[PDB]
Amino acid sequence: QKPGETKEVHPQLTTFRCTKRGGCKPATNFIVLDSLSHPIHRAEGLGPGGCGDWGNPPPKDVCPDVESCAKNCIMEGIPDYSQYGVTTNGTSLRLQHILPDGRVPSPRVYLLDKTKRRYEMLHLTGFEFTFDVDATKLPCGMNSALYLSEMHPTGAKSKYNPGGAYYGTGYCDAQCFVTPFINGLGNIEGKGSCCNAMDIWEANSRASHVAPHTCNKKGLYLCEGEECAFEGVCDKNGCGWNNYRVNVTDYYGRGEEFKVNTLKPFTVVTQFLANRRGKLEKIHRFYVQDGKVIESFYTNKEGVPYTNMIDDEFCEATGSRKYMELGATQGMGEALTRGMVLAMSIWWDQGGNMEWLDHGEAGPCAKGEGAPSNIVQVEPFPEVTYTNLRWGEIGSTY
Ligand SMILES: *[C@@H]1O[C@H](CO)[C@@H](O)[C@H](O)[C@H]1NC(C)=O
Ligand SMILES: *[C@@H]1O[C@H](CO)[C@@H](O)[C@H](O)[C@H]1NC(C)=O
């Protein structure tokens, strides 16, 4: 859409680049909200309303073609990110789901490089990514997420998309969802926005999930028809890793009786281990709390290979068919090596209560506990804070 008059004021976030010899060194980065979360309205004289809702093409009368959509739909800058539940303080990023004015911004943001015009590209095969988190105010049904998508570095800045990454354009993931704009351009044919995605962190205070998602396409692919579906170009399900699903029920939760106690803040380490030819082979997650390393659990379920790490053998044995067919752990790693954009978000799920994260086989939450109508009785103001984002050499971030 056309950038409007209103100025965009991005929150600044200090992050770190780490090596064993040099330790962790500060770097200046900026934070940008998703393009379609900025105010999107019609050009002067066309009346009130936006340019389409999630899941659909843009409206045909303001957008009959890309060129008309590019002048008839306006995307305003956000001068005060706090009005969308997004604030920073030095090395910390606070995401608030619900505000006191009653809105539910549910923010999704990306990490911009120091120029503000290009996303920070992370290349993590053979390296590790680490962060500290406070998950106390995330009850059953909430999802705080921190992940990588293979978005274009400038947000696909182009003739009809002059805003680019400065405005948060170019979102994609492995779900191939239909959005009214893709790469900042009206999505006239209602295609889906597809790309490889590494779900580093999807969690609340009750459960923690990790999952790589492969696609057989490089970068953002605009799919049509069956390309967008389950047997198409991307792996919807991913290769999931959750202590509850592998029958280790005392690892993570609210209380001293769990090895990772979500009543207190903790550190989350994720290592992308490669073979001697440079291809990703294993994904290893462990935690640090109160100055002590907390090793990963090992699997404990009949029919699941004994492992403390994500790998092809584990993914295949747990039924992750599309993950294997669309590239497997090596394919995930090839996307990581090309370069990925960091996304952070906080959201709930009116349709299914986030059951795949923390109910049944996945956690301790009861049927209905995760509904939004019930979340607000437990915690009226859900939020998450991420602090000291840092990445680099194996063994150097913690
Ligand atoms: C920013 O962080 C410092 C602690 O490092 C804290 O003392 C201060 O209250 C924080 N600022 C805001 C606006 O919360
Ligand atoms: C789950 O773990 C318990 C031990 O805590 C064990 O008795 C049970 O057999 C395990 N279940 C499966 C399906 O392996």
CSV table of C-alpha atoms and ligand atoms in Angstrom, one decimal:
chain,number,residue,atom,x,y,z
A,1,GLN,CA,0.0,0.0,0.0
A,2,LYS,CA,1.2,3.8,-0.4
A,3,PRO,CA,3.0,5.2,2.7
A,4,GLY,CA,0.9,8.0,4.2
A,5,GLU,CA,1.8,11.3,5.7
A,6,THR,CA,2.2,10.1,9.3
A,7,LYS,CA,5.7,9.7,10.6
A,8,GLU,CA,6.9,6.2,11.5
A,9,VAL,CA,8.9,6.2,14.8
A,10,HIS,CA,10.6,2.8,15.4
A,11,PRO,CA,11.5,1.6,18.8
A,12,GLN,CA,15.3,1.1,19.2
A,13,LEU,CA,16.5,-2.3,20.7
A,14,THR,CA,20.1,-3.1,21.6
A,15,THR,CA,21.0,-6.7,20.7
A,16,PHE,CA,24.3,-8.7,20.8
A,17,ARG,CA,26.8,-10.5,18.5
A,18,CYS,CA,28.8,-13.1,20.3
A,19,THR,CA,32.1,-15.0,19.9
A,20,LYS,CA,34.1,-17.2,22.3
A,21,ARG,CA,37.2,-14.9,22.0
A,22,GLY,CA,35.3,-11.6,22.1
A,23,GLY,CA,32.3,-12.3,24.3
A,24,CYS,CA,29.0,-10.6,23.5
A,25,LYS,CA,29.2,-7.1,21.8
A,26,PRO,CA,26.3,-4.7,21.6
A,27,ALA,CA,24.6,-3.8,18.2
A,28,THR,CA,21.9,-1.2,17.5
A,29,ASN,CA,18.7,-2.5,15.9
A,30,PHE,CA,15.1,-1.2,15.4
A,31,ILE,CA,11.6,-2.7,15.7
A,32,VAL,CA,8.9,-2.5,13.1
A,33,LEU,CA,5.2,-3.6,13.3
A,34,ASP,CA,3.7,-5.8,10.6
A,35,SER,CA,2.7,-3.7,7.6
A,36,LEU,CA,-1.0,-4.7,7.7
A,37,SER,CA,-1.1,-3.8,11.5
A,38,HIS,CA,-0.4,-0.2,10.6
A,39,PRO,CA,-3.5,1.9,10.0
A,40,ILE,CA,-4.6,1.0,6.4
A,41,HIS,CA,-7.3,3.4,4.9
A,42,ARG,CA,-8.5,4.6,1.5
A,43,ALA,CA,-7.2,7.6,-0.4
A,44,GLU,CA,-8.9,11.0,0.1
A,45,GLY,CA,-12.5,11.0,-1.3
A,46,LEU,CA,-13.1,7.2,-1.2
A,47,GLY,CA,-14.7,7.1,2.3
A,48,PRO,CA,-14.0,5.1,5.5
A,49,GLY,CA,-12.8,1.6,5.9
A,50,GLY,CA,-9.7,-0.5,5.1
A,51,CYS,CA,-8.4,-2.4,2.1
A,52,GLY,CA,-9.4,-5.9,3.1
A,53,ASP,CA,-9.2,-8.3,6.1
A,54,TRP,CA,-6.9,-11.2,6.8
A,55,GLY,CA,-7.7,-14.2,4.7
A,56,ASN,CA,-9.0,-12.4,1.6
A,57,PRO,CA,-7.8,-10.5,-1.5
A,58,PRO,CA,-8.3,-6.7,-1.3
A,59,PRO,CA,-11.7,-5.3,-2.3
A,60,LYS,CA,-12.1,-5.2,-6.2
A,61,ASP,CA,-13.5,-1.7,-6.5
A,62,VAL,CA,-10.5,0.1,-4.9
A,63,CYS,CA,-8.2,-2.7,-6.0
A,64,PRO,CA,-9.0,-4.0,-9.5
A,65,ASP,CA,-5.3,-4.3,-10.2
A,66,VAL,CA,-2.0,-3.8,-8.5
A,67,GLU,CA,-1.5,-0.3,-9.9
A,68,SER,CA,-4.9,1.0,-8.6
A,69,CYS,CA,-4.4,-0.7,-5.2
A,70,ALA,CA,-1.0,1.0,-4.9
A,71,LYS,CA,-2.5,4.5,-5.0
A,72,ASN,CA,-6.0,3.9,-3.5
A,73,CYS,CA,-4.9,2.2,-0.3
A,74,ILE,CA,-2.7,4.2,2.2
A,75,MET,CA,-0.6,2.8,5.0
A,76,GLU,CA,0.1,5.3,7.8
A,77,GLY,CA,3.2,5.6,9.9
A,78,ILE,CA,2.9,4.8,13.6
A,79,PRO,CA,4.4,7.7,15.7
A,80,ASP,CA,3.8,6.0,19.1
A,81,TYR,CA,4.4,2.3,19.2
A,82,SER,CA,3.1,2.1,22.8
A,83,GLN,CA,-0.4,2.4,21.4
A,84,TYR,CA,0.1,-1.0,19.8
A,85,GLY,CA,1.5,-2.6,23.0
A,86,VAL,CA,5.1,-2.4,21.8
A,87,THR,CA,7.8,-0.7,23.9
A,88,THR,CA,11.5,-1.1,24.4
A,89,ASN,CA,13.9,-0.2,27.3
A,90,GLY,CA,17.6,-0.7,26.4
A,91,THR,CA,18.0,-4.5,25.7
A,92,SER,CA,14.3,-5.3,26.5
A,93,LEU,CA,11.3,-5.6,24.3
A,94,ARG,CA,7.8,-5.7,26.0
A,95,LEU,CA,4.8,-7.0,24.0
A,96,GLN,CA,1.4,-6.3,25.6
A,97,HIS,CA,-1.6,-8.3,24.2
A,98,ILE,CA,-4.3,-6.1,25.7
A,99,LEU,CA,-4.3,-2.5,26.6
A,100,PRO,CA,-6.2,-0.5,29.3
A,101,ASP,CA,-8.1,1.4,26.6
A,102,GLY,CA,-9.7,-2.0,25.7
A,103,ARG,CA,-8.0,-2.7,22.4
A,104,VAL,CA,-6.3,-6.0,21.8
A,105,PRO,CA,-3.3,-5.1,19.6
A,106,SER,CA,-1.7,-8.6,19.7
A,107,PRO,CA,1.4,-7.1,18.1
A,108,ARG,CA,3.7,-8.9,15.6
A,109,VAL,CA,7.1,-7.1,15.0
A,110,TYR,CA,10.3,-7.7,13.0
A,111,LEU,CA,13.9,-6.8,13.7
A,112,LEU,CA,15.4,-4.0,11.4
A,113,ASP,CA,19.1,-3.4,10.9
A,114,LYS,CA,20.7,-0.1,11.9
A,115,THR,CA,19.6,1.7,8.7
A,116,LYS,CA,15.9,1.0,9.3
A,117,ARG,CA,15.6,0.1,5.6
A,118,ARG,CA,16.6,-3.6,5.6
A,119,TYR,CA,15.7,-6.4,8.0
A,120,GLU,CA,18.5,-7.8,10.1
A,121,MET,CA,19.4,-11.0,8.3
A,122,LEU,CA,20.4,-13.8,10.7
A,123,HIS,CA,22.5,-16.7,9.3
A,124,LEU,CA,22.3,-19.4,12.0
A,125,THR,CA,23.4,-22.8,10.7
A,126,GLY,CA,26.4,-23.8,12.8
A,127,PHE,CA,25.6,-21.0,15.3
A,128,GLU,CA,23.3,-20.4,18.4
A,129,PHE,CA,20.6,-17.9,19.2
A,130,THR,CA,19.7,-17.0,22.8
A,131,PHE,CA,17.3,-14.7,24.7
A,132,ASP,CA,16.0,-14.1,28.3
A,133,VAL,CA,12.2,-14.2,28.9
A,134,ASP,CA,9.6,-13.4,31.5
A,135,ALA,CA,6.6,-15.7,30.8
A,136,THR,CA,4.7,-15.2,34.1
A,137,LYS,CA,1.8,-13.4,32.6
A,138,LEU,CA,1.0,-16.0,29.9
A,139,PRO,CA,-1.7,-18.4,31.0
A,140,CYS,CA,-3.2,-21.4,29.1
A,141,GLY,CA,-4.2,-20.4,25.6
A,142,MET,CA,-1.7,-17.5,25.1
A,143,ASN,CA,1.2,-17.8,22.7
A,144,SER,CA,4.3,-15.7,23.0
A,145,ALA,CA,6.3,-16.4,19.8
A,146,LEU,CA,9.9,-15.7,18.6
A,147,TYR,CA,10.8,-17.1,15.2
A,148,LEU,CA,12.5,-16.8,11.8
A,149,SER,CA,10.8,-16.4,8.4
A,150,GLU,CA,12.6,-16.3,5.0
A,151,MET,CA,11.3,-12.8,4.1
A,152,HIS,CA,13.0,-10.6,1.5
A,153,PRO,CA,15.7,-8.3,3.2
A,154,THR,CA,14.1,-5.0,2.0
A,155,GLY,CA,10.6,-6.3,2.4
A,156,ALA,CA,10.6,-6.6,-1.4
A,157,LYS,CA,10.8,-2.8,-1.9
A,158,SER,CA,9.6,-2.1,-5.4
A,159,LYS,CA,7.9,0.4,-7.8
A,160,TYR,CA,4.5,0.0,-6.2
A,161,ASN,CA,5.9,-0.9,-2.8
A,162,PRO,CA,8.1,2.0,-1.9
A,163,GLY,CA,7.6,1.5,1.9
A,164,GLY,CA,9.4,-1.8,2.1
A,165,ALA,CA,10.9,-3.1,5.4
A,166,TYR,CA,10.7,0.4,6.9
A,167,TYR,CA,7.0,-0.3,7.0
A,168,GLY,CA,7.2,-4.0,7.9
A,169,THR,CA,6.2,-5.3,4.4
A,170,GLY,CA,6.8,-8.9,3.1
A,171,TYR,CA,5.5,-11.2,5.9
A,172,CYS,CA,5.4,-14.9,5.0
A,173,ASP,CA,5.5,-18.2,6.9
A,174,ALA,CA,4.9,-22.0,6.3
A,175,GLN,CA,1.1,-21.7,6.6
A,176,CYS,CA,0.7,-20.0,3.1
A,177,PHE,CA,-2.1,-17.7,4.5
A,178,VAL,CA,-4.0,-15.3,2.2
A,179,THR,CA,-3.3,-11.7,3.1
A,180,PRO,CA,-4.8,-8.7,1.1
A,181,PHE,CA,-1.3,-7.4,0.4
A,182,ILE,CA,1.8,-9.6,-0.2
A,183,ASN,CA,5.3,-8.0,-0.6
A,184,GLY,CA,3.5,-4.6,-0.2
A,185,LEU,CA,1.4,-5.2,-3.3
A,186,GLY,CA,-2.4,-5.8,-3.6
A,187,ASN,CA,-3.0,-9.6,-3.7
A,188,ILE,CA,-5.6,-9.4,-6.5
A,189,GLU,CA,-5.7,-13.2,-7.1
A,190,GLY,CA,-5.9,-14.1,-3.4
A,191,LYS,CA,-2.6,-16.2,-3.5
A,192,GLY,CA,-1.1,-17.4,-0.2
A,193,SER,CA,2.2,-16.1,1.2
A,194,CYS,CA,4.6,-19.0,1.7
A,195,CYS,CA,8.1,-19.4,3.0
A,196,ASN,CA,10.4,-21.6,5.1
A,197,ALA,CA,10.1,-20.8,8.9
A,198,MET,CA,12.0,-21.8,12.0
A,199,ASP,CA,9.7,-21.6,15.1
A,200,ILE,CA,12.3,-21.1,17.7
A,201,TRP,CA,9.9,-20.3,20.5
A,202,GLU,CA,6.1,-20.7,20.8
A,203,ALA,CA,5.2,-20.8,24.5
A,204,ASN,CA,3.3,-19.7,27.6
A,205,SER,CA,3.9,-20.4,31.4
A,206,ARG,CA,2.4,-23.9,30.9
A,207,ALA,CA,4.1,-25.3,27.8
A,208,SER,CA,7.1,-24.7,25.5
A,209,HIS,CA,7.2,-25.7,21.8
A,210,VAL,CA,10.0,-25.7,19.2
A,211,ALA,CA,9.5,-26.5,15.5
A,212,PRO,CA,11.3,-26.2,12.1
A,213,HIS,CA,9.0,-25.9,9.1
A,214,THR,CA,10.3,-26.6,5.6
A,215,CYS,CA,9.2,-25.5,2.1
A,216,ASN,CA,10.4,-26.6,-1.4
A,217,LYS,CA,10.7,-22.9,-2.5
A,218,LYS,CA,13.4,-20.3,-1.7
A,219,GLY,CA,12.2,-17.0,-0.1
A,220,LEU,CA,8.6,-15.9,-0.4
A,221,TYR,CA,6.5,-18.0,-2.8
A,222,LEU,CA,3.0,-16.8,-3.9
A,223,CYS,CA,1.0,-20.1,-4.1
A,224,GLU,CA,-2.2,-20.9,-5.9
A,225,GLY,CA,-4.8,-23.6,-5.5
A,226,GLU,CA,-3.3,-26.9,-4.2
A,227,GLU,CA,0.2,-25.3,-3.8
A,228,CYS,CA,-1.2,-23.7,-0.7
A,229,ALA,CA,-2.7,-26.8,0.8
A,230,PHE,CA,-1.3,-29.7,3.0
A,231,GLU,CA,0.3,-31.6,0.1
A,232,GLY,CA,1.7,-28.3,-1.4
A,233,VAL,CA,4.9,-26.3,-1.2
A,234,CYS,CA,5.2,-25.9,2.6
A,235,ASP,CA,5.0,-28.0,5.8
A,236,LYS,CA,2.1,-26.8,7.9
A,237,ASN,CA,2.6,-29.0,10.9
A,238,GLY,CA,6.3,-28.7,11.3
A,239,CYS,CA,8.5,-31.1,13.3
A,240,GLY,CA,7.3,-30.5,16.9
A,241,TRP,CA,9.4,-30.6,20.1
A,242,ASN,CA,7.4,-30.3,23.4
A,243,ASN,CA,8.4,-32.1,26.7
A,244,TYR,CA,4.7,-33.1,27.3
A,245,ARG,CA,4.3,-34.7,23.9
A,246,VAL,CA,7.4,-36.9,24.5
A,247,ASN,CA,6.1,-38.0,28.0
A,248,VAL,CA,8.3,-35.8,30.3
A,249,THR,CA,5.6,-34.0,32.3
A,250,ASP,CA,7.8,-32.4,35.1
A,251,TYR,CA,10.2,-30.3,32.9
A,252,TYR,CA,8.5,-26.9,32.5
A,253,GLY,CA,5.7,-25.1,34.3
A,254,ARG,CA,4.5,-22.9,37.2
A,255,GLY,CA,6.2,-24.1,40.3
A,256,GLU,CA,9.4,-25.3,42.0
A,257,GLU,CA,8.4,-28.9,41.0
A,258,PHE,CA,9.4,-28.2,37.4
A,259,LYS,CA,13.0,-28.0,36.2
A,260,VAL,CA,12.2,-24.7,34.4
A,261,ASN,CA,10.0,-22.7,36.8
A,262,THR,CA,7.9,-20.3,34.8
A,263,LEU,CA,7.0,-18.3,37.9
A,264,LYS,CA,10.5,-16.7,37.4
A,265,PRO,CA,12.4,-15.4,34.4
A,266,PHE,CA,14.8,-17.7,32.5
A,267,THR,CA,17.2,-18.0,29.6
A,268,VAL,CA,16.5,-19.9,26.4
A,269,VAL,CA,19.4,-21.3,24.3
A,270,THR,CA,18.9,-22.7,20.8
A,271,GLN,CA,21.8,-24.3,18.9
A,272,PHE,CA,21.8,-25.1,15.1
A,273,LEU,CA,24.4,-27.9,15.0
A,274,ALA,CA,26.0,-28.7,11.6
A,275,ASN,CA,27.9,-31.7,10.2
A,276,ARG,CA,31.5,-31.6,8.7
A,277,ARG,CA,30.1,-30.4,5.4
A,278,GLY,CA,28.2,-27.5,6.8
A,279,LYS,CA,24.7,-28.9,6.7
A,280,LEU,CA,22.3,-28.6,9.6
A,281,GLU,CA,21.8,-32.0,11.4
A,282,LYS,CA,20.5,-31.3,14.9
A,283,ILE,CA,18.5,-28.5,16.8
A,284,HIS,CA,19.3,-28.4,20.5
A,285,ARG,CA,17.3,-26.5,23.1
A,286,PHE,CA,18.4,-26.0,26.7
A,287,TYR,CA,17.7,-23.4,29.4
A,288,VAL,CA,19.5,-21.4,32.1
A,289,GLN,CA,17.8,-20.3,35.3
A,290,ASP,CA,19.2,-18.7,38.5
A,291,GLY,CA,22.7,-19.1,37.0
A,292,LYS,CA,22.4,-22.9,36.5
A,293,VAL,CA,22.4,-24.7,33.1
A,294,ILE,CA,19.2,-26.9,32.8
A,295,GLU,CA,20.0,-29.5,30.2
A,296,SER,CA,17.3,-30.7,27.8
A,297,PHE,CA,15.1,-33.6,28.7
A,298,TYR,CA,15.4,-36.8,26.6
A,299,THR,CA,12.3,-38.3,25.0
A,300,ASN,CA,10.4,-41.0,27.1
A,301,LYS,CA,7.7,-42.4,24.9
A,302,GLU,CA,7.3,-45.8,23.3
A,303,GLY,CA,7.8,-45.6,19.6
A,304,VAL,CA,9.8,-42.3,19.8
A,305,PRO,CA,13.6,-42.6,19.2
A,306,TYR,CA,15.6,-41.8,22.4
A,307,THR,CA,17.0,-38.3,21.8
A,308,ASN,CA,17.6,-34.9,23.6
A,309,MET,CA,17.6,-33.0,20.2
A,310,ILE,CA,15.5,-32.5,17.1
A,311,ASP,CA,16.9,-34.5,14.1
A,312,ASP,CA,15.6,-36.3,11.0
A,313,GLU,CA,15.2,-39.6,12.8
A,314,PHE,CA,13.0,-38.1,15.5
A,315,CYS,CA,11.0,-36.0,12.9
A,316,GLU,CA,10.3,-39.0,10.7
A,317,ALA,CA,9.3,-41.3,13.6
A,318,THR,CA,6.8,-38.8,15.0
A,319,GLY,CA,4.9,-38.5,11.7
A,320,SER,CA,6.4,-35.2,10.4
A,321,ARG,CA,5.9,-36.3,6.7
A,322,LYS,CA,5.8,-33.0,5.0
A,323,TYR,CA,8.8,-31.7,6.9
A,324,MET,CA,10.8,-34.7,5.6
A,325,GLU,CA,9.5,-34.5,2.0
A,326,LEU,CA,10.0,-30.7,1.6
A,327,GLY,CA,13.7,-30.8,2.7
A,328,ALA,CA,14.2,-32.2,6.1
A,329,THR,CA,16.7,-30.8,8.6
A,330,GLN,CA,19.3,-30.1,5.8
A,331,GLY,CA,16.6,-28.1,3.9
A,332,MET,CA,15.7,-26.1,7.0
A,333,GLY,CA,19.4,-25.4,7.4
A,334,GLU,CA,19.8,-24.2,3.8
A,335,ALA,CA,17.2,-21.6,4.4
A,336,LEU,CA,18.9,-20.5,7.6
A,337,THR,CA,22.2,-20.2,5.7
A,338,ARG,CA,20.5,-18.0,2.9
A,339,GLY,CA,19.4,-15.7,5.7
A,340,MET,CA,16.2,-15.2,7.8
A,341,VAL,CA,14.2,-12.3,9.4
A,342,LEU,CA,13.4,-12.4,13.1
A,343,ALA,CA,9.7,-12.0,14.1
A,344,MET,CA,8.3,-11.7,17.7
A,345,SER,CA,4.6,-11.8,18.6
A,346,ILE,CA,1.9,-12.3,21.3
A,347,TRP,CA,-1.5,-13.8,20.3
A,348,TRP,CA,-4.5,-15.9,21.3
A,349,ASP,CA,-6.9,-18.2,19.4
A,350,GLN,CA,-10.6,-17.8,19.4
A,351,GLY,CA,-11.3,-20.8,17.2
A,352,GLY,CA,-9.3,-23.5,18.9
A,353,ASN,CA,-7.9,-22.2,22.2
A,354,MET,CA,-4.3,-22.9,21.2
A,355,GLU,CA,-4.9,-26.5,22.1
A,356,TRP,CA,-1.9,-27.8,20.1
A,357,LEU,CA,0.4,-25.8,22.4
A,358,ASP,CA,-0.8,-26.7,25.9
A,359,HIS,CA,-3.7,-29.1,26.1
A,360,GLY,CA,-4.1,-32.9,26.1
A,361,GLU,CA,-0.9,-34.5,24.8
A,362,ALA,CA,0.7,-31.1,24.7
A,363,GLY,CA,0.2,-29.8,28.3
A,364,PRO,CA,-1.8,-29.4,31.5
A,365,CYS,CA,-4.5,-27.0,30.3
A,366,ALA,CA,-8.1,-28.2,30.6
A,367,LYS,CA,-10.7,-28.2,27.8
A,368,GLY,CA,-12.0,-24.6,27.4
A,369,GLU,CA,-9.3,-23.1,29.7
A,370,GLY,CA,-7.5,-21.5,26.8
A,371,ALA,CA,-10.5,-19.6,25.4
A,372,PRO,CA,-10.0,-15.8,25.3
A,373,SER,CA,-13.1,-15.4,27.3
A,374,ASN,CA,-11.4,-17.4,30.1
A,375,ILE,CA,-7.9,-16.0,29.6
A,376,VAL,CA,-9.0,-12.6,30.8
A,377,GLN,CA,-10.4,-13.9,34.1
A,378,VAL,CA,-7.0,-15.6,34.8
A,379,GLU,CA,-4.9,-12.7,33.6
A,380,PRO,CA,-6.6,-9.5,32.4
A,381,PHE,CA,-3.4,-8.1,30.8
A,382,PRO,CA,-1.3,-10.8,29.2
A,383,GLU,CA,2.2,-9.8,28.1
A,384,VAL,CA,5.7,-11.1,27.5
A,385,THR,CA,9.2,-9.5,27.7
A,386,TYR,CA,12.2,-10.6,25.7
A,387,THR,CA,15.6,-9.3,26.8
A,388,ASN,CA,19.2,-9.5,25.6
A,389,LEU,CA,18.7,-11.0,22.2
A,390,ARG,CA,22.1,-12.5,21.2
A,391,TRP,CA,23.5,-14.8,18.7
A,392,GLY,CA,26.9,-16.2,17.5
A,393,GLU,CA,29.4,-18.9,18.1
A,394,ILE,CA,28.4,-22.2,19.8
A,395,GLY,CA,28.9,-21.9,23.5
A,396,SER,CA,29.4,-18.1,23.6
A,397,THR,CA,26.0,-16.7,24.4
A,398,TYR,CA,25.5,-18.1,27.9
B,1,LIG,C1,13.9,0.5,32.2
B,1,LIG,O1,14.8,-0.5,32.8
B,1,LIG,C2,15.3,-0.1,34.1
B,1,LIG,C3,16.0,-1.3,34.6
B,1,LIG,O2,17.1,-1.7,33.8
B,1,LIG,C4,14.2,0.2,35.0
B,1,LIG,O3,14.8,0.7,36.3
B,1,LIG,C5,13.2,1.2,34.5
B,1,LIG,O4,12.1,1.4,35.4
B,1,LIG,C6,12.7,0.8,33.1
B,1,LIG,N1,11.9,1.8,32.5
B,1,LIG,C7,10.6,1.8,32.3
B,1,LIG,C8,9.9,2.9,31.6
B,1,LIG,O5,10.0,0.9,32.8
B,2,LIG,C1,5.3,-42.4,30.1
B,2,LIG,O1,6.2,-42.3,31.2
B,2,LIG,C2,5.9,-43.2,32.3
B,2,LIG,C3,6.9,-43.0,33.3
B,2,LIG,O2,6.9,-41.7,33.9
B,2,LIG,C4,5.8,-44.7,31.8
B,2,LIG,O3,5.2,-45.5,32.9
B,2,LIG,C5,4.9,-44.8,30.6
B,2,LIG,O4,5.0,-46.2,30.1
B,2,LIG,C6,5.3,-43.8,29.5
B,2,LIG,N1,4.4,-44.0,28.4
B,2,LIG,C7,4.8,-44.4,27.1
B,2,LIG,C8,3.7,-44.3,26.1
B,2,LIG,O5,5.9,-44.7,26.9
